Structure formats: structure tokens, C-alpha cells
């Protein structure tokens, strides 16, 4: 079986969904922009040699409906002979896209694929078109969302410190140019309604402090709740993308792999213990890779809530490694959690950090709504 | 890499979307019904050993939103530990579910998966929540009818093929040919009384070429040839398959009913609607090391008679239509519930392969906005 290498990995800026950069830019255009860009940045790839396009997106209606992967590819002027499919495993959708594309390559059904995802939460909000089956109805929000923080004694103060850290790290990455290698300037509109090329994550708040976060009211129970809006993922609009191929094809084309997929895992877990997914998903991915958590040099763990990611970090035995290894350029608290895009976004952030840290192994993992988890171990070379 | 075998393949009846069987049954319930059924029918499979569930569905909002694969699996009381994902390649979605699950097994990331799909077109119609990018392109007569104009497929030829679809589907209904694949499914009869349906309510046995000849063109009034009567029906339904490595099947003492020989997906020109099955099938056959003549049974999704006839012609199969193609009818009679159709035609194909003692079958379909998907199955 062929091994699967990532040859390029890019993303849009994360726009503020509530009135920000991409309020007048459609999901298919954010997507098409990255698809076009992946091709443009890699001249040795002839576009018609793409074998498939896998794209994550959750709220598949309105501008995200009717197979956005294909709509975006047509808008990007990728040859119509290249097929395209849209994948939905909620939060993990574009990491799923990576997995299915990689397996298409491993089996020889493909040699090159585009992978990525998008979520335009400003245009197709999570609350839009909801009709949950009565049979899944399952105070209950706090009960479930804070189960892990109650279990692991993760206080409001620890959550606020982690959230302040997310913005501080994302801002330091912005200021130092550390995100320049992954962000493709993308057109949006500034506060005055004027066309603007964005080359930074609008959604990061450099004014964030632990003091200010400490003023906020609990999102759930007013008396015992610890989660706040300030320690939950931001609401952003964005896309992320990767060019993946067999190691053979990369060699033929004379492209240096940026990373290789070492293992992939996806798991179910109890939906009522929200956010636990990364633990069994990461353990399974590590087992499949022949590695332990200690072998991993850089982790990207999606920050849906500080109240959930901290327990996961604690359970994987990583609490003392947070500042050396985990979400080193911040995470979804600062950058947002545009569902469809997040899997490829954290994989893109991870690979760039691996390069800068000269890391041998990286792990990207995330929780998934209604009790799932997904993880990928990446290896450099 | 492991060979991937299909141990079971089942579907609901196709309910009439306009006020028929499943008007009060949710998409997640049609899906969960089939998941439960696969488990009941294969008792040596322990549900906690499922490695994933891939489910096709296109209109993923309302009751089909928020990853219906998972929601249906939880409703079916499949253990929480089993993951689930919903896939969307329009018309080809549940065939895509098959391919991705197959490859998960081939690479050893899985040993057993559920595959299937659903589309409840009554509850989430194709016209709901549409916002098509202004910069982009089955409507518009020019594109829908291009193949029929290139190949000289007349109104009369289209009406003939459509009447044949209902006739073959009704014959299958009467002969018991669908008994093995249809799981009786709760719906409501015309008076609102609970009823277990075990037949495809949407088929119209009274269809005649004479009646079809009366209909108006769907597109241009003057020169249009396609009609609603020669386009796929609107039905609600689900289909599902239990797929596993040949090794795991042996361990569980479950008999393989077919195995995957090859898989293909291709893009094609979106302005030449319905052509996908041609390059998809040619690619699948090439990868299989087979020719079209090796295939004993073909399932070619009937989006429009005007498009499937040219596809048949370009694959060199015009003389084999009654011998090999859509032998129990197709989407003109049975409907085209997008998410479900890939697994549905695969299910119908595998059961026909058994009834005909075939070695090779090919199932293929066009996909909106210019794609094609195909699978070659083998029965050893
Ligand atoms: Ca480069
Ligand atoms: Ca080391
Ligand atoms: Cl069956
Ligand atoms: Cl077989
Ligand atoms: Na490796």
C-alpha cells in the first residue's frame, strides 16, 4: 500500500462570524479560493491528475447545500473531470475527509486528492434548520457539557487561564509571522464595508485577559456553572485545505513531503459525556502508530471548551506538557470552531508547527458532537 | 489487503413522497429500522464490533441534519462506541458510503461496517433551502436533453422505456423477486391506519405508453421530449448493507453474498447531464480486468429515460437491455431518493445476481453537476 504524504496545507483567515470579514463572502468562494490556491502554489501538479476532492461541511443547506465540494471545485475552475464529495462527521468532518482521501490513495484508487473543509457560520448558523428527533432529546446542557470538568476538578479559574492563553498564543503567532506560511490572504470587507484582503485571524482578541474573562457569567447553571462564552470556541467563518498524494507521486513530481500520515483513528463515545472523544481517539491512534503520548512532540487538540479539553489533556497524561507541546499557536477559543473546516485547520496548524519545531511526530485530535472523537498521527519525514 | 464482502443488503419499500406510506415516519427512523434489521438478520455479529457506519444523505437539514448516520445509529441503539459519518455525493452518496467503508476495511482500519443511505423527499424536498451560487449552472432543458439530442432518442423511445420500468417493477413485485431485499416497514395507509408495508407503493402498474404519450414536456413546450412520466419518481426510502472483510465473515460463519471487485468515480461535463455512467463504468470495468460483455446484470440508475438510453448505447448495451439491465425496473418506477439510491440499486443488483446465478454485476449512476460512480460486484 502507498504511504500518504501531505505536500501542502493552507487555510483562510478565521473571520468573525458576527459582522466580520466574510459576512459578504460565500462558503463556496472561501472553498474555491483555497482549492485554486493549492494548485497555484504547486505548479508541478497538473490539475486534471487530481483523483478526487473530499470536503468537510456540516450545515449542508443554503450556500452549503447540494455537495459544496463539487460546487467549489467548479468555481475554482478545476477540470470538470475531477470528482468531489462532501463529508459530514460534525466537528471532525475535514479530518474525516483527510482519512477517506488517504485510504483512497493507500488502496491505489487514487494517487492525488484535495482535502479540506469549510463552515460559514455567519451564513448558515448552527441553529438554522434544526429538527432533532424527539427520541434523542437526552439544566441538561450544563450536566453534559461540564461532566468532565466536574469529574476532573477543572475550575473556572483554570478554564479562564487556558482561554486567555489561547488568545495570547494566537496573537503571538500573528505578530511573529508564524501564521504567514499557512494563511492565504483572502478577500473580505473591513468594518466600513470596503473590500479588504485579510492576512490575519480577525477573530483573535489581543485585549483578552484572565481578569476580563473572570467577569463573565456562566453559560449554564448560574451558581455552579464554570463554562463561559469566553472559554468556549469562538464563532468564526473559514476554510482549510491540503494537497495529499502517494509518496510515489510526490517523488515523481519532485515535491518534498511536509508530513506523512502515520495513523488514523475514529471512535464513538457516550454522548452525554461531552468532549471526551480525544481521549479514546488519541489512545487508538497512538496504539495504531506504535507510539505513546510521550513520543508526540506537538499536539493540536480542538478547543471546543476549556472545560473539556483540559480534562482530556489530564487524562492523556499531558498536563505538565501543555506549554511545551499543546496548541502552541492557540486554538479554537481564539480562532473559532467553523465545524467543517476545523479538522483540516488544526492539521494545517500542526504541520506548520512541526516544521518550525523540527518535530518528528504530531497528533491532531478533536471531540465530535453527539459523542465521537477523531485523531491523526503525523510523521516528519 | 482484505477482500471486502457483502454479507447482507436490504431496503425499505419505496414510499410515495406525495402523501404516501412514510409521510409520518422520519428519515432517522427509516434508517434506524434498517440498522436494527441488519443486526437482527445476522445474529452472530455483535453490534459493538462495528468499526464505523457510513450513511448517504443529500438534503442534510431538519430531520436529516447534524449527521443523520449517528442520529439513526443512536436511535437503533447501536452502542455509543460505534462511530458514524454522513456522506454527500448527491445521487451517488450511498454508493460512495460503500466505497469509503470498503477502503476502510481494505487498509485494516476496520473489519466490519454498516453502509447505507436515506432520503426522505417528502420531509426535506429537493427544492427546500436552495441557494445555488450565481456563478454556477435535473432542470434546464438544454442540459437535460443534450444526450437525447446527440443520440436521437425520441419521445416515443423514452415513453417506451418508462412504461417498461413500471412493468418490470410490477412483475418483480408479483413474482416475489423483491421478497428477499424488502424489510417490511411501518407506515400509514390512505386512511391514516398503521400499516406494515412490504411492497413499493410508488410503482404504477397501470402505466402505459398511451397514457405517457399524453403528458406535456417538462422543459421546452415545442421541442422538449422529457416528461415527469419519464423522469425518476419521488419516493421516500432507505437501503443498507452489512460489509466486512472476507476474514471476519469466515470467523462469524456468515456467508458472503457478493464481494467488491472494483470501484470508480469520475467527474464529467456538468452541461451534458446524465453522462456519468459511461466513463464511470468504463473505468470500473478497466480496473476489474473485465469487459462489458462479462457483466451478467447491470443496474443503471434511471434519473431520466432521455439520459440512460444514450448511456446504454455508448456502453454498447442496447441489445442487452431486456436480458441484463434494470431487470426489476428502476427509478422511473421506484423513485430516486438521492441518499438511498446507491445502496438501493446495489441491493437490487445483488439479489438479482443471486436469482440469475450471475458471477458479475455492475451498478452505476449519474450524479448531479456532472459526476458518475460505479461498482463491479462478484459472486464467487
Ligand atoms: Ca511549498
Ligand atoms: Ca522523539
Ligand atoms: Cl436481501
Ligand atoms: Cl461472493
Ligand atoms: Na510514517
UniProtKB/Swiss-Prot annotation, chain A:
It comes from the Bacteria. GO terms for biological process: fatty acid beta-oxidation; phenylacetate catabolic process. It is found in: Cytoplasm. Pfam families: Thiolase_C, Thiolase_N. One of its GO terms (molecular function) is acetyl-CoA C-acyltransferase activity. The keyword Metal-binding does not apply. Pathway: Lipid metabolism; fatty acid beta-oxidation. CDD domains: thiolase (cd00751). InterPro entries: FadA, Thiolase, Thiolase-like, Thiolase-like_sf_Thiolase, Thiolase_acyl_enz_int_AS, Thiolase_AS, Thiolase_C, Thiolase_CS. Its main location: cytoplasm. It catalyses: an acyl-CoA + acetyl-CoA = a 3-oxoacyl-CoA + CoA. The active site is at 91 (acyl-thioester intermediate), 337 (proton acceptor), 367 (proton acceptor). It is an enzyme of class 2 (transferase). Belongs to the thiolase-like superfamily. Thiolase family. Heterotetramer of two alpha chains (FadB) and two beta chains (FadA). HAMAP family: FadA (MF_01620). This is 3-ketoacyl-CoA thiolase. It comes from Salmonella typhimurium (strain LT2 / SGSC1412 / ATCC 700720). The gene is fadA.
Amino acid at each position: 500500500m502507498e504511504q500518504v504524504v501531505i505536500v501542502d496545507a493552507i487555510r483562510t483567515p478565521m473571520g468573525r462570524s458576527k459582522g466580520g470579514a466574510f459576512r459578504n463572502v460565500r462558503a463556496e468562494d472561501l472553498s474555491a479560493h483555497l482549492m485554486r490556491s493549492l494548485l497555484a502554489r504547486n505548479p508541478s501538479l497538473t490539475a486534471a491528475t487530481l483523483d478526487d476532492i473530499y470536503w468537510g461541511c456540516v450545515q449542508q443547506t443554503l450556500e452549503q447545500g447540494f455537495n459544496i465540494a463539487r460546487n467549489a471545485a467548479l468555481l475554482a475552475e478545476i477540470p470538470h473531470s475531477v470528482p468531489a464529495v462532501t463529508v459530514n462527521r460534525l466537528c471532525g468532518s475535514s479530518m474525516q475527509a483527510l482519512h477517506d482521501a488517504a485510504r483512497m490513495i493507500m488502496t491505489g484508487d487514487a494517487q492525488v486528492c484535495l482535502v479540506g473543509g469549510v463552515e460559514h457560520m455567519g451564513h448558515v448558523p448552527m441553529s438554522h434548520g434544526v429538527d432533532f428527533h424527539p427520541g434523542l432529546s437526552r439544566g441538561m446542557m450544563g450536566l453534559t457539557a461540564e461532566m468532565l470538568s466536574r469529574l476532573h476538578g477543572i475550575s473556572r479559574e483554570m478554564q479562564d487561564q487556558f482561554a486567555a492563553r489561547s488568545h495570547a498564543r494566537a496573537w503571538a503567532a500573528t505578530q511573529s509571522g508564524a501564521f504567514k506560511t499557512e494563511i492565504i490572504p483572502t478577500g473580505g470587507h473591513d468594518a466600513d464595508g470596503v473590500l479588504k484582503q485579510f492576512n490575519y485571524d480577525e477573530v483573535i482578541r489581543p485585549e483578552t485577559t484572565v481578569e476580563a474573562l473572570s467577569t463573565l457569567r456562566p453559560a449554564f447553571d448560574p451558581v455552579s456553572g464554570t463554562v463561559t462564552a469566553g472559554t468556549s470556541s469562538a464563532l468564526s467563518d473559514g476554510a482549510a485545505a491540503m494537497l495529499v498524494m502517494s509518496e510515489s507521486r510526490a517523488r515523481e513530481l519532485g515535491l518534498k513531503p511536509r508530513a506523512r500520515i502515520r495513523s488514523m483513528a475514529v471512535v464513538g463515545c457516550d454522548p452525554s459525556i461531552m468532549g471526551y472523544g480525544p481521549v479514546p481517539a488519541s489512545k487508538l491512534a497512538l496504539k495504531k502508530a506504535g507510539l505513546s503520548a510521550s513520543d508526540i512532540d506537538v499536539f493540536e487538540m480542538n478547543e471546543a471548551f476549556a472545560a473539556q479539553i483540559l480534562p482530556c489533556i489530564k487524562d492523556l497524561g499531558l498536563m505538565e506538557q501543555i506549554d511545551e507541546k499543546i496548541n502552541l499557536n492557540g486554538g479554537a477559543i481564539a480562532l473559532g470552531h467553523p465545524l467543517g473546516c476545523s479538522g483540516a485547520r488544526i492539521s494545517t496548524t500542526l504541520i506548520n508547527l512541526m516544521e518550525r519545531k523540527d518535530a518528528q511526530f504530531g497528533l491532531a485530535t478533536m471531540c465530535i458532537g453527539l459523542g465521537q472523537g477523531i485523531a491523526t498521527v503525523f510523521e516528519r519525514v
